[PDB]
Amino acid sequence: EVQALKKRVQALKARNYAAKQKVQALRHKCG
């Protein structure tokens, strides 16, 4: 479902956005 996949994309991006910041934050903290 297009509408379904869109929400999947948004859900992923939401987690991805947070995770990406975490990775770079951690790279700053202990990289």
Partner: protein, 31 residues
């Protein structure tokens, strides 16, 4: 398109998978 969204979901999923690996590792070593 569905196919577009699927390749997008797979894009996010691929990154997401890696982000969680890196976050877990960075935290396991630092956090």
């Amino acid at each position: 398109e569905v196919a577009q969204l699927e390749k997008e979901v797979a894009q996010a999923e691929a990154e997401n998978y890696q982000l969680e690996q890196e976050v877990a590792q960075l935290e396991h070593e630092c956090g």
